[PDB]
Amino acid sequence: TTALVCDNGSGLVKAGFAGDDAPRAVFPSIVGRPRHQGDSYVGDEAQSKRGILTLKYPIEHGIITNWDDMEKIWHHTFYNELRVAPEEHPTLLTEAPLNPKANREKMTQIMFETFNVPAMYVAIQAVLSLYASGRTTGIVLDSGDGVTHNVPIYEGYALPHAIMRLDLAGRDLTDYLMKILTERGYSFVTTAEREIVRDIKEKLCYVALDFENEMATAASSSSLEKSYELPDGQVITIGNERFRCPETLFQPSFIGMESAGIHETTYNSIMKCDIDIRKDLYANNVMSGGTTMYPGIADRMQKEITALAPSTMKIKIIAPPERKYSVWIGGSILASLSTFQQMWITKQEYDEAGPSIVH
């Protein structure tokens, strides 16, 4: 039998078969129900029918908060995207770091009681990303759609006391760029327009090695300008917007938040950990999630952590090309191991013991 891997993303579901190199299904973590009851849609079909539906994010901040809609996302995943009978496949689910214990239990209860999977497992997203980089010790920066975490990991296990959470990720950067471009005179307010600005963000944005220098260059030449044709036929040119957008990850004050930036959350996370493991964390900073895809983010992180860390500390930022899917790939690996097969919670163990078995 083939095991399934479902990464329950704040913005995107990544689902597929354990052993595959990439998720076969990548779709928005969105459920749409009729505006007027006289039934649900999920993912791209929900967005297409948005004019007749109310759209909701059941996993908006990395934590599943709407269980009836998460049921719909999982039903869509099994039956519409992967086209499998869930009762025929062990299923690996991902959870956010600091997922409440009752939340993990509800994920377990739905898998067995609603979908009758024969076996399941819940793994921490950041832990899977570390495994996908061939490591069991290191500190992950996972920046997705709705949340960013630092997760220090030692000998295979997250250190929950040192986890840092930043309520700032890719959704917030798209919102910032929407606001910036709207103020420039291009109206970007609707769902369809959010899609356009997201596309501009992913194609043209980058992280400046030195913000102040990059601003001086954009102020004094056209050399950083990039153009993008909108659906209405207008050509928009952006310059400093390209790097002011993701600079928000290092200066959350750009969108009015008092939070530490990702360089300070990474450094604080490491300093919460055993002094004796900090050398290994500094040398093994892995970046995961779509919001770490910006060109220049690894060099910027190298520079910022160097300025914060002891003068002699060896600092390595690992940014794999496949890091949009590294949480999913780490699940594909773990669930493929012979040593993992005894780790599955079976439906039989669930029927004997109930949801508290997941711990």
Ligand SMILES: Nc1ncnc2c1ncn2[C@@H]1O[C@H](COP(=O)(O)OP(=O)(O)O)[C@@H](O)[C@H]1O
């Ligand atoms: N090349 C890219 N550059 C910048 N942001 C990107 C890129 N590719 C994807 N993203 C952003 O990453 C987010 C989705 O990342 P992902 O790790 O799937 O999030 P989640 O797991 O929380 O659903 C979106 O905000 C998307 O716009």
Ligand SMILES: [Ca+2]
């Ligand atoms: Ca994620």
